[PDB]
Structure formats: structure tokens, C-alpha cells
Amino acid sequence: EDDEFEDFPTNIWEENWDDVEVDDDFTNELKAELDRYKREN
Amino acid sequence: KYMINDAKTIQLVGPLISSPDNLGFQKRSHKARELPRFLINQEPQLEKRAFVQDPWDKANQEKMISLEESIDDLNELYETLKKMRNTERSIMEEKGLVDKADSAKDLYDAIVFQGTCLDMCPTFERSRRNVEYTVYSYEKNQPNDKKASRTKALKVFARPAAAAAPPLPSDVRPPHILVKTLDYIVDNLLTTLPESEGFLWDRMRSIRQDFTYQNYSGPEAVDCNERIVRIHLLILHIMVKSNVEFSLQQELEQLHKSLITLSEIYDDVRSSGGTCPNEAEFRAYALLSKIRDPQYDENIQRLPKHIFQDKLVQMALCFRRVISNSAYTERGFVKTENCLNFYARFFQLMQSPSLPLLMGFFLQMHLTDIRFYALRALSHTLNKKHKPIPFIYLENMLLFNNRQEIIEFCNYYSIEIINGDAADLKTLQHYSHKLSETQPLKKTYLTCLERRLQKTTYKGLING
Amino acid sequence: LEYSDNGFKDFLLKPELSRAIIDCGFEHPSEVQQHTIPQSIHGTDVLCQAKSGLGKTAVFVLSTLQQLXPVPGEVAVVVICNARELAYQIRNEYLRFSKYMPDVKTAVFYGGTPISKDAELLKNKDTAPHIVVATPGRLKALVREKYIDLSHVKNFVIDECDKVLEELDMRRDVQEIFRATPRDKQVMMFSATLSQEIRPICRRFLQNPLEIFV
Amino acid sequence: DMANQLLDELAHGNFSHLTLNLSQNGREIAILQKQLTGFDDKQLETFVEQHPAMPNDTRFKIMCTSFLNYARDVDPWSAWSSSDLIFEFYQCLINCLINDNAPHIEMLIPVATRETEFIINLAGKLDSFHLQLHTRSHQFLSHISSILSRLFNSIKPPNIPGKQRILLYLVNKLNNIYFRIESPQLCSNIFKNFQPKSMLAHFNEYQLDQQIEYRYLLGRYYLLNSQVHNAFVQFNEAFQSLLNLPLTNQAITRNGTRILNYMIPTGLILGKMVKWGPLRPFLSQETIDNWSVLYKHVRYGNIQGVSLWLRQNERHLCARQLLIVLLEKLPMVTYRNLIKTVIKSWTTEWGQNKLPYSLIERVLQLSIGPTFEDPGAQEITIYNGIHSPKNVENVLVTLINLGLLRANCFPQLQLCVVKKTTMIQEIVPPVNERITKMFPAHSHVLW
């Protein structure tokens, strides 16, 4: 619907998200790229 | 005029409540009252309008032309035309083709103005400048000719003056002549640049004024304003390349003023179900006119998909992002978070052959600013003991045309120069591209664009 | 190698006012016009100084007309000037923009004019002017004779305030005339030159102004 | 003499029958229209003037005449034909309310609020047919905003007077009008003058409902001017209040999901992910998945993913004036995470404090992927034209200036050196602390 309000008759943010590490395909591919570069040199 | 009364519209809008009969109302014929004063909308003309002139009006214009040919004394001609104008003005007022400058109309029967100036410049106007000696050499048929030639003259932008009688239809010229006049400028006057920058700028400003008098916004008005903007862009590059002193501010003000006027016409055509074939290109220039103004980013978002997805607009948006720098300091400017400041990407775009040439001319006005913040930003990521940056690296980065250009840039911002080939960026002190005491540095250009311009004629570029 | 941290369509004017602007071709705002017109429509008092020939007169005329609420039996705004010829210019300026507002009536007054005639047209409902521009001498006489009801004054416009305020007698007159007008109103003045000495005198009767000096 | 009874009631401040909603006023009007038919306008004026108990104020009398004139000529079968009467009465009603000493102003205020919400519904309904009515788009609403703007300017602080009780009511109404007519920059005047006019000691003394809506529109206004931090503090404060109200109304929930549509991306720009626990009732399950994909791309530094996601969600983002802001602000956060990932696996774990540009270029090649200059894409789009893996130097330098990275770069040596520390916190500071420090926002509490 439209953004206008209708009529009227607790933390929610991930404070520590950079601290916790969660694996995913992209990071594992990225880590593979760094490993390849280090072995080359 | 009254409120409209159509069965379809009444049925389309629908009844005020569910059932008037239950409430006790009875159907009753009601007079068609006048529409409320806030409801009146004066739709500007959007289609071609047939050109018509009174037989006396055209006969009068023919008669004064013969007098101009026959009479040789300039003062005699000007006085006679002035008397003829006074008699002509009274006839038009009684005829009803011009306001009396004191009437009180209701805006519902306001006179739709219709210019009748068949030639390039009004005959009386040409005579007046003959005695003022304000006729440029371009308009004269020969450099020694005393009076301006009709086939080559042009109308001067009449600045608004207090207690000035409203123009007669004989002065303002019809749109289908303005297209012819603009075609005259494009073909036979563009090569005169840059020595005629002030002449063309004044004359083109007059051309847009004639549209304003007629309250016309038809296809000719859109076409004419489109080419006026392109002239300003091309005339913008010529002045800096040729290095001729010129009032840059009045060029940008008129260029921006034309763009909002041109953009405003686009909205009306869209609101009326029409279309303008070259809307995408001139939306792009509007974005570039104020690079660091967020108001222009929201306007481009409300536009339809086909406009927003056109490559010209997409190219314009890419530039606005890469210019966006968070460290940009200017009086009365508020910084924004996470600005890219992609100076290196910006110069890669300016060399791209897909960049339309006219946009490139527009962006050259920001070269000094971007280069400054590129060097300012780079300076903050060097330790105190870093070696000076060689000029060869900077020229590759910032696209300086020659070593003489970079040394002037470093010298302007009090950047120390070492061995005549390296810049010591740690000595930069200014955090803003502008210095309060000093005059702004002269605008520069890119050799890639200048070389690209020389491979295409002016008129071929302006028309498109 | 170690780290080391360190165009007047943006204001939504009246359709009658906009069309009158269009028919004159004056569609090129000045620098003072660019800054003040968005501020003028808000109603904030402005003490702006601008050079001659920049269309300073039209700046407030648009502002007055945009804020003008036309009531047949009262005068809306009052413009005060010292020069008779300049006053006639202001009326002519008003006439051009009032082209499509027939309900608006405007008249001018000056010293040496039959005061009875000026009161006569004011008394008539048909010739009652919503806008009046007058010399300080004539306006003071009209006010002191209770000929003009100033309770409905909304905007107070002064042209060349420094020149008028420089003369102490006319400084007395404008102060006296200002008393007949309600405090809750907009006061705006303009002049080609505005020195620092006249600013506190201008600021004496001004509250929260916008000062622009050349 | 039924009309005379109404005038006696009207002149005594009882405005029970003074309303434009025929659903609760139709019977009275039909009797009135039956009696008042065939009357000249001057007769109506003389009818009001001679009527006793009528206040001497001209503006109040005009409003009564306009209502009587409205009742005479109302045609319920066609709202369009009746538009002129309705809008003329409403403008005269508000005009009667301008003077702070107008008679019966205390009882007049509830009527004006009641009528205003009626006209806005009518004006929106009419403006949907601007083509068939030969009127410019958004003309009825634009007229009302001017009507209320005069009323809003008439509010001046001097017990709570009637006007001050609805000061925030006008501001929410005016701003919603300005946003709907697609002229949000007009709201700037409203916000600047809102605080000086209010006589309340503190902003929180207004009703909680009108506080939340004001913050939502204010934060929405800030986001248009690309000031995300000022926008975020308003959105976050507004949503915190909304969690206090009970959720059983089911109209709060639709309002809660409206603010989240802006709070979530604005919070993301400042590097703040949001738990999906508390937000489960407000957001649909599909919307959770849509934002989760964006979070996954931007958390782990995948520029191509962010660009692809923006391309997929272009239209609805562009509707909310979000595409340009997200496309410009998000990439810098994405780079920070990308550089954080490589540094953590290169400096902190392999003991190398020097980052060659060639290494970073290989990383950027994998993240950004195909670009405009690459043979894959010919035309330049806003998605594939801005980011290129060749500008390794420019990416690092703009991170250091923003404070998101603490390193020194050596253009001549083609490498950037960074502090040698086991803990990565020293090298790459937390995102939200740095951005907030560099761009302090106005306090959430207004006054």
C-alpha cells in the first residue's frame, strides 16, 4: 500500500554482527582466492 | 466559463453518498455555476498552432519595409517608424490583439498572443539600433553598411523595463520563424565563435523570450530550447579551449534556467499523454547541472521506466555517484555519509568513446574540483616521511594535458614542487577547492574531448 | 614502512500572478530575487539591499500580491516612499502585475494633492484601494485625520528606508503611522544602499529579520 | 422556519449539524434544501445578517452564509457537480479559524479537524480523474495545502488554546499532502517553523500517535536529502515508540511495516543489521527473505550481489526514493567488509602487514566481476558502470578518508601498509561507531 500512515484509534539491532563469523559460499570462494595468491608468491 | 456538465463524467465520479432518495433528497435541475477560482487551469499550447495575421497588420509591415529601403537618413527613418508604431499600436488595441497595459481581465478571456514578425528581426527594432550604433558587424550586410540588413539581422533580448508597453504582435515572431532563425544561427554563425560569444548568447536569450511572450510550448518550442542548450554546451567548451575572457556564471545560469524550463515542458506533455522523442538526453543534462544537489536525484526517480533506463540517464547517474565526495567542503553545503569520491573511475569514463560529446563538455567544468579532492584525499593516506609524488604518476591519474598544466595547478593551491617533476602532497593545507581571497583558477579541458570535437562539425553535432 | 595514524515556477504562485509574469517575459530571477522570494512567501521580514536595475521593485510586489487577501472594505498593505515620481512608478509596477486581478484596487497619494478627493475615493466602495502607496507627509495627514483604517494592514513595505529614516521628521512620521497599524504584521524595506548606522534604527521596529547588505 | 432553528443553534456554538458528511447529516439538509430552495444569494446574506444572536464578526457570518448556500445547491447524485460548494465552504471555514479571537473558536476546532479529513478523502478521489475533469494532476490536494498553510502560519504561541492542541495535527496533515503531491521539499518550511510556534515545554508532551507520524515524515524528509544518519535517528526513535502501543489494533501493524520499509535500508547504510525476531509480526515472510539476501551480500562484501539485488528490486525501491541512495551509500560499506575479510586472512593470521595492490585487485576482480568495459556488457548501466576492479588505489584511499580503514598506501610502491596487530579491531574499526563519529546526527529528542 501507500506510505502514508493510517489513523490510531527492546533492542532489535544485531549489536555484534562483525564479531561473529558465519560461513557462506562467497567467503569460502574468497578465502580460496587468497590461498591461491599466497601460494603463487 | 462554468463547471463541466457531462453524463459520462458525472457517472464516472459517482454519487456523493449511497442513496439520496432514502435521505429524502429529490432530484433537481441545478444551474451550471462558474468553476471555482482555484480550479481554473490555463493549459499551455502543446500542438502546432496555425499562423494567422490581420491583412492590415501584414500590409503595415510591408509598407514600413519599403520606407526602410527608400529612406536613407537613419534619424529620419527612426522617427517616422516611431510615429507609425504609435498609430499601429492604437489600431491593435482597438483590434484586440494586444493588452492595453491597464486592463483588468479575468484570466478566462485573456488574449492569446500571436506574433507576426515575419523577418528575422522586427523592422522597427532594426531601425532603432541603427541610430544607437549597436549593430554588430555580423548583422550588417557589409562591414561599412550603416543600417543592418534584414536578411542577416537578429532581435536583441529586450530586458524588462519599468512602465514598458507590452510588445505588439509585429515585434514578437511566430514559432515557425524562430525555428528558421535558430537554423540561421546554427549554420551561419557558429563558426564565428569564440569572438561572438556575447552576441550569440544575447540573441539566443531573445529567442526563448519570444516563446514566453506567446505562452507557447509546442513541438517547435521544445525543439528550439533543445538546440539552445546544446549551443551553450558547445559554446562552453570553445571559450575555455580558446582561452577568452567571458562571464562563465551567466552562461551556466542561462543554461540551467533553460534546462528547468525545458524539463517543465516535458512534464506537461507527459501529463497530456504525449511524448517528446528527446526527453532522455535532456533529463541527463539536468542531473549534471547541479552535480551535488540531492533534489535532482529524487526527480529522476519519479520518471517512468523507459526514461530512467535510457543510456543517457544511466551515464549521467554514474557520474553523479563517482563525483560524490564526503569531504566536499563549501559554504552552505551539508556533507553526506559514505560518498564514493571515485575520482579514478571518473577519468576512466571521460575517455570512454561511448560518452556523448556534449555531456563531456558539461563535465569539464568540474575538473578542477575533482582533481583537488583527488589530491586532498590521497594526501591523507601518506605517512609524514613519504617521498614526493612524481608528476608522471599524477598526469596518468588525473589526466593533465601537459606538465605545464599540472605545475600551474600545484602552484595555485600552494603545493610544494620538488625538482620540477614531483609534488609534495603533505604540504597541502587547504581543505576546500575554493580560496576566499584568491580568484578561482581558470577552467581547463581535456585533450581527449578537444581532439574528439575536431572530427565532427559544429552544426552536425548541434542538430544531432 | 610502518603505519602512522593521522524561472519563478518553484514557488507555486497564483495562476493570475504567474500568467502576468509570463506575458511580460520577465522570467529571469536575480540573485536577490532567487534568495528572497522563497523567504518572502513564508512571511519572514527581510532587510535586503540590492543594486539598482535588478528589478528590486517587482520583488515585493510579487510577494505582496501572493500574500494578498482581497476584502472590498479594507486596505491590505501600505507602501511608503519619499519620491512622488517613484511612487507613480510603483503604481505602474502594480498595474502591470495586477492585470488579471480585477478585484484588486490600488491608488497613490502625495503632498499637494486635494486630501478631500483622496478621502472621497477611499470612502467609495467601488474605488476603495486594497493597496496604497503614499508620501510620508500625505499618509500621516490621512492617518491623523482617521481617514484610513489601518487595523487590516498585513504587510508594511518601505522603499529606500535609509533615505526616509535619515530625515528625523519623516522618521517621526513613519513611527507615528506604524502605531496606527497592528504590531502583528510583516514589515519589509528595501534600498539601493544600506549603511551600518541605519541598521539599528531599522532593527528597532524589526523582529527576527533577514538582513542582506551589499 | 427550520433554517432559523439551525441558525439559532449555529450561533450558539453548537456545531452538531455543521458537517459535510451527509451520511450523518443528510436528513437535515434535505429538509433545509426543501425550505431554502428558490432563494437569492443576497436573501441568504440578509437572512444571516438580520438573524439575532449572530456574532458581529464578518468572517464568521460569511461561513454561515456559505454553508446555507451549500445546502441550497448540494446535489448528492454527483460529487463532482457539488465540488465547488464543498471546497468554498471548507476554505471559508478555515478562514473563520484564522483569527485567534474568532467567536466560538473553542468549539470550532473539533469541526475543522473533522472536516479536514473529509476533504482530503474527497480531494484525492477527485484528483484521480484529472484527465476527464480537464484539471492538472494533484490540483485539489494542492489547493487544500494552501488552505492549511494559511492556518498553520496563523499559529503563534501566547492553559492550552484550541489551536495549539492541533498544531501537530496540521503538520502531519500538511506533510502528507506535500509528499502525496510529489513536492516534499515544501516540507522544509514546516519543520523549521514547527518548534517556534509550539508552546509545549517538551516535544514528548504531544500525543504518542502524532509524535510517531511526525518522526516518520521527518526521517523520510531527511532521507531525501541523502542525510542517512539524521534520517536513521528519527526512524529508530519512531519505531521504538510504536513498539509500546498494543498490536491488537491491526492498523498499527500496517503502520509498523511502513516505517520498517525505510528503517531497514537506512540502518544498513550505517552498518547495522536488524534481528528478525521482534520484526516478525510486522514484515511478511517474503520481505524477510528479500532483505536477507541483501544483508548476506553486504555483510560479506560482494559488490556484484548488491548490484544484482538492486537491479532485481529496482522498481519498488525507486518508488520509495531509495534506489539512488542505496546504490551510492551501500558500496562503501560493502568494500569495508571485503577489505576486512582479506586483511583478517592476510595480516592477522599470516603475519603480513603489507597489502600489495595486485592482491587486492584479484579480490576486487572476484567481487565486482564483469563491468561495463568488459566484453560481456556493452551499454553502460548504473549497475555495471560505477565499480571496476582496476581502481584498487581509489577504493583504498576513499576507505581511509572515511575512517573505515586505518592504513597508509604507497602509490609508487603499489602497496598499502597497515598496523601489525593480532586483533583486527585496531586495523578495521566497527562501522557504526566511525560513521556516527564523523557525521553526528541531531538528537532524537527535539526539545
Find out whether B363 and B348 touch, Cβ atoms under 8 Å: no
Residue D212 per-residue DSSP state: H
Sheet with C186-191, strands from edge to edge, namely C106-109, C131-134, C77-80, C155-159, C186-191, C46-49, C210-212
Burial per residue of D52-87, b for 16 or more beta-carbon CB atoms within 10 angstroms, e otherwise:
eebeeeebbbbbbbbbbbbbbbbbbbbbbbbbbbbb
* φ, ψ for residue C207, nearest 5 deg: -125, 125
Rounded to an integer, what distance in angstroms lies between the CA atom of residue C151 and that of residue C183?
A: 10
Contacts of residue C126, Cβ cutoff 8 Å, sequence gap at least 6:
none
| CA atoms of D222 and D440, how far apart (whole Å) | 14
Question: Which residue of chain A comes nearest to D209, CA vs CA?
Answer: A8
Compute how many other C-beta atoms are within 10 angstroms of the C-beta atom of residue C61: 21
Radius of gyration, CA atoms only, chain D: 30
Which among D132, D227, D397 is the nearest to B381, CB-wise?
A: D397
The whole-angstrom separation of Cα D377 and Cα B218 is: 38
**How many CA atoms does the CB half-sphere of B457 hold within 13 Å?**
10
Report d(CA D60, CA D58) in Å as an integer: 6
Contacts for D220 with CB less than 8 Å, ≥ 6 apart: A3, D179, D184, D231, D262
Give the span between the Cα atoms of C191 and C196, in whole angstroms. Answer: 13
Taking phi first (over 0 means left), then psi (-120 to 50 degrees means alpha), and beta for anything else, what does residue B77 get? alpha
Q: Are D109 and D162 in contact (CB under 8 A)?
A: yes
Distance CA B304, CA B283 (A): 12
Residue B45 DSSP label = B
What is the DSSP secondary structure assignment for residue D203, as one 8-state letter?
A: G
Contacts of B301 (CB under 8 A, 6+ apart): B308, D318, D321, D323, D324
**Chain A residues close to D267, C-beta within 8 Å:** 13
Residues of A in contact with D209 (CB under 8 A): 8
Instruction: Compute the distance between CA of residue D111 and CA of residue C72 in angstroms, rounded to an integer.
Output: 28
DSSP D274: B
Alpha helices in chain C (DSSP H): 15-24, 31-42, 56-67, 84-97, 115-123, 136-144, 161-166, 168-180, 198-204
Name chain A contacts of D272, Cβ cutoff 8 Å. Answer: 13-14
Looking at the complex, report in whole angstroms how far the Cα of residue A11 sits from the nearest Cα belonging to chain D: 9
**Closest among C50, C113, B101 to C133, alpha carbons compared:** C113
Contacts of C4 in chain D (CB under 8 A): 408
Residues of B in contact with C93 (CB under 8 A): 162-163
| Dihedral angle over CA of B148, B153, B157, B162, nearest 10 | 40
Q: What is the resolution of this structure in A?
A: 3.3
Write the DSSP symbol of residue B139: T
Distance, CA of B112 to CA of D218 (rounded, Å): 44
Residue to mutate among B291, B337, B370, B391, with most D CBs inside 10 A, is B337
Tell me the domains of chain C and their CATH numbers: 33-212 (3.40.50.300)
Q: How far apart are CA D403 and CA D411, in angstroms?
A: 19
Pairing status of strand C77-80 against strand C155-159: parallel
D353 and C CB contact within 8 Å: yes
Of the candidates C188, C42, C24, the one whose C-alpha atom is nearest the C-alpha of residue C95 is C24
User: Which positions in chain A touch D215 (Cβ < 8 Å)?
Assistant: none
What's at C198, amino acid-wise? I
Instruction: Choose from C2, C3, C45, C67 for mutation: most chain D CBs within 10 A.
Output: C3
In contact, D233 and D220? CB cutoff 8 Å? no
CB contact under 8 A, C102 and B101: no
Interchain CB distance below 8 Å, B104 and C100 = yes
Helix (H, G, I), strand (E, B), or coil: what is residue C78? strand
Q: Give the position of cell 526563448.
A: B208
- Which of helix, strand or coil describes residue D110? helix
**B385/C56 Cα distance (integer angstroms):** 58
| Residue boundaries of the structural domains of chain D | 1-447
Query: D344-372 burial string, b = 16+ CB within 10 Å, else e?
Result: bbbbbeeeebbbbbebbbbbbbbbbbebb
Q: Rounded CA gap, D117 and B104, in Å?
A: 37
Nearest to B162 among C2, C27, C89 (CB): C89
DSSP for C82-112 reads S-HHHHHHHHHHHHHHGGG-TT--EEEE-TT
Q: Is A25 on the interface with D (CB under 8 A)?
A: no
Q: Which residue of C has its CA nearest to D183?
A: C10
Task: Check contact B-A (3+ Cβ pairs < 8 Å).
Answer: no
Q: How far apart are CA B342 and CA D402, in angstroms?
A: 13
* Exposure letters B130-140 (e unless 16+ CB within 10 A, then b): bbeeebbebbb
Q: Which of C38, C122, C115, C31 is nearest to C73 (CA)?
A: C122
Cα angle, residue B220 at apex, residues B218 and B221 outer, rounded to 5°:
65
What is the rounded CA–CA span in Å between residue C164 and residue C170? 6
Phi then psi for B93, rounded to 5 degrees? -60, -50
Confirm if D334 and A5 have CB atoms less than 8 A apart.
no
- D91 and C CB contact within 8 Å: no
C-alpha cell at D181: 503531491
Are B77 and B67 contacting, i.e. CB atoms less than 8 angstroms apart? yes
Experimental technique of record? cryo-EM
- Residues sharing a CB contact under 8 Å with residue B267, sequence separation 6 or more, in sequence order: none
Amino acid at B461: L
SS3 B175: helix
DSSP state at residue B165: P
Which of C33, C48, C46 is CA-nearest to residue C209?
A: C46
